[PDB]
Amino acid sequence: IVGGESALPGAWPWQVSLHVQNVHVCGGSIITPEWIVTAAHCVEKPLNNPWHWTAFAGILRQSFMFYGAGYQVEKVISHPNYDSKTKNNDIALMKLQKPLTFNDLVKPVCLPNPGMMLQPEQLCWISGWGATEEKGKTSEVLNAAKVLLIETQRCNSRYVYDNLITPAMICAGFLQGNVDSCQGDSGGPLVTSKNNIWWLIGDTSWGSGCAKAYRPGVYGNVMVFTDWIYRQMRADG
Amino acid sequence: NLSTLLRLVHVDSFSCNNLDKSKIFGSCFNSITVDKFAIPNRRRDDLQLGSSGFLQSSNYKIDISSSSCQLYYSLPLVNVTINNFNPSSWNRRYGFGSFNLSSYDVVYSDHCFSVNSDFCPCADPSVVNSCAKSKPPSAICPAGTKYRHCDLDTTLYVKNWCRCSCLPDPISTYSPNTCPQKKVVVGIGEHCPGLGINEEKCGSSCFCSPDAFLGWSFDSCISNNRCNIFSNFIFNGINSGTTCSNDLLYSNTEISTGVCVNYDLYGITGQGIFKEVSAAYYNNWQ
Numbered sequence: 001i002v003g004g005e006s007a008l009p010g011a012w013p014w015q016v017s018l019h020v021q022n023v024h025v026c027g028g029s030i031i032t033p034e035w036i037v038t039a040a041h042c043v044e045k046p047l048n049n050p051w052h053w054t055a056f057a058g059i060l061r062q063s064f065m066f067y068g069a070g071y072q073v074e075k076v077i078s079h080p081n082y083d084s085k086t087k088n089n090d091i092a093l094m095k096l097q098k099p100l101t102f103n104d105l106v107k108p109v110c111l112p113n114p115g116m117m118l119q120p121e122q123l124c125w126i127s128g129w130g131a132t133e134e135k136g137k138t139s140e141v142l143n144a145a146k147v148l149l150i151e152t153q154r155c156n157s158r159y160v161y162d163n164l165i166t167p168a169m170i171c172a173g174f175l176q177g178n179v180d181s182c183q184g185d186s187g188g189p190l191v192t193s194k195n196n197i198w199w200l201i202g203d204t205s206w207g208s209g210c211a212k213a214y215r216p217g218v219y220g221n222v223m224v225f226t227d228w229i230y231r232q233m234r235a236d237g
Numbered sequence: 238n239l240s241t242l243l244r245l246v247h248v249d250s251f252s253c254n255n256l257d258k259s260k261i262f263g264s265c266f267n268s269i270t271v272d273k274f275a276i277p278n279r280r281r282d283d284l285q286l287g288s289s290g291f292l293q294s295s296n297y298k299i300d301i302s303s304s305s306c307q308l309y310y311s312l313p314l315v316n317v318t319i320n321n322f323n324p325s326s327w328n329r330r331y332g333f334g335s336f337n338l339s340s341y342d343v344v345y346s347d348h349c350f351s352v353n354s355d356f357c358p359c360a361d362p363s364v365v366n367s368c369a370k371s372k373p374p375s376a377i378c379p380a381g382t383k384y385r386h387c388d389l390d391t392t393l394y395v396k397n398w399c400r401c402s403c404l405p406d407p408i409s410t411y412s413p414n415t416c417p418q419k420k421v422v423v424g425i426g427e428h429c430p431g432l433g434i435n436e437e438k439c440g441s442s443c444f445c446s447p448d449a450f451l452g453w454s455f456d457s458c459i460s461n462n463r464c465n466i467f468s469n470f471i472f473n474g475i476n477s478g479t480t481c482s483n484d485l486l487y488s489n490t491e492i493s494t495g496v497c498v499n500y501d502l503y504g505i506t507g508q509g510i511f512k513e514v515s516a517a518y519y520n521n522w523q
Contacts, residue, residue, distance in 0.1 A: 086393065176414055177412060213400075
């Protein structure tokens with residue numbers, strides 16, 4: 001997050017950070033208290049053995065324990081049609097072995113129903129634990145920023161990406177710069193204000209630097225993969 | 238003399254701002270500054286007293302809090318020419334030519350851009366060598382000005398992908414802050430420093446293409462076989478200076494012979510009767 005401010009302890013209970021080898025690598029979001037929605041590029045072959053994974057919830061500053069007080073991941077389900085060259089279909093699901101009962105500052109986000117009729121220049125918000133300005137370290141405190149949704153046709157311009165965005169993937173950010181996520185902001189909850197309820201419609205997959213001109217943010221689209229999550233949840237139970 | 242001025246010129250409309258037409262007949266002023274330029278037929282309505290048009294923001298701005306009078310007159314099309322010269326300094330430095338347009342056509346500006354001294358629409362060719370996609374032309378910029386800002390960045394798998402600033406054009410760019418060419422508005426009695434130059438068609442010495450200059454148009458100014466030219470009269474001060482008008486003492490300029498009337502001939506006052514007579518004893522100073 002570049003150009004943002006520190007996130008006050010309000011009500012944002014849809015950000016779960018995954019920790020492996022006692023260090024933070026990638027985050028994620030939760031929709032139901034039985035799964036974890038996160039990116040799929042961190043679930044590669046060297047990142048196997050999901051037993052060595054923990055999840056933290058309701059934790060702003062990442063210092064409250066040491067190799068303990070977490071939720072162990074039982075199984076991880078990734079999208080079968082995942083490509084490592086073009087980075088397409090970068091959505092993975094992690095299942096927890098704990099009931100995860102609802103408590104204070106614990107409230108998931110509902111999936112977006114088909115046919116939302118979203119505005120072209122819709123206002124959204126981002127959050128995560130990444131660098132500060134450029135090639136920095138993991139942020140100790142939680143920060144948030146405000147981004148806008150740009151069109152796919154304008155994102156496919158020859159001077160921006162030259163037609164490198166799939167129809168099942170969208171772009172969000174500012175073309176002027178100074179508002180972008182750096183390396184380490186994997187996943188991240190991208191929600192918007194509509195009908196007094198937030199909708200998770202974004203998922204960070206990759207990116208070309210941060211706070212750079214003609215290089216907006218990259219956030220996946222879950223409107224096409226919404227049925228896949230329901231299918232996996234039905235096949236699991 | 239205002240009367241002779243309006244008689245010898247085909248005046249179409251004479252209106253002023255913050256000044257009355259009666260107090261300018263016999264008074265004195267300190268100085269008078271006059272500005273004139275052609276009136277395009279497309280932007281003829283933009284010459285009103287206060288408007289956010291292209292003329293009043295790119296070519297010449299008319300002040301409202303000053304005593305300035307606007308004069309609209311016409312000129313015959315016989316033995317008339319139009320001079321289209323670019324007052325820009327940095328544009329002609331890189332080899333700016335002429336518009337090469339037909340006669341009886343004027344050039345008006347719609348988007349003016351201001352740049353600093355450290356500016357060069359040219360890139361260092363030693364850096365553009367490691368570029369494969371959207372490779373901009375480069376040449377040797379003269380000393381004293383930095384080269385074009387271009388960076389090498391990889392998005393997914395393209396190693397040789399170079400991006401520069403001012404894309405696609407400085408008129409409508411996605412990041413005006415990164416591009417040094419910024420839009421400027423002319424002030425009271427100020428010219429436009431220069432127009433936008435497309436960096437994709439520039440570049441031996443850095444020579445931009447003549448077709449890369451954008452942000453201007455052209456249109457005829459012929460109306461009823463006559464050309465329209467604007468005129469602005471600005472009066473500095475009132476009831477002062479040494480610039481007066483002869484609209485009072487030269488009222489009749491005709492004398493009678495046979496009746497008695499007063500006279501103020503050359504500071505001599507009195508009354509008497511006149512009579513024509515042939516005299517040949519006067520000199521050039523008597």
